[PDB]
Amino acid sequence: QRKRLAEKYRECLSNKEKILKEIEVKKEYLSSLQPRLNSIMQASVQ
């Protein structure tokens, strides 16, 4: 049981690192999207 809990805790650490990687990259993507939106607004009679 201590083996199972240690391995599952290492798997949860890897999943938390993946969630953080998703989030970091996701945040960067969101920032890029915001810049694109700003560019579109600048491009934008009406």
Next chain:
Amino acid sequence: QRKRLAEKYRECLSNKEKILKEIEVKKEYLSSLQPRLNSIMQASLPVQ
């Protein structure tokens, strides 16, 4: 009275010419803004 009627007819013709110039300006503005919106969308699609 005939001179005043001729002046009123000239003012009405000037108002009709101004309305025709405004309609032509609106048509030219739409025709220019069509390709301008096309270029703006083509510029926005590269940024997207």
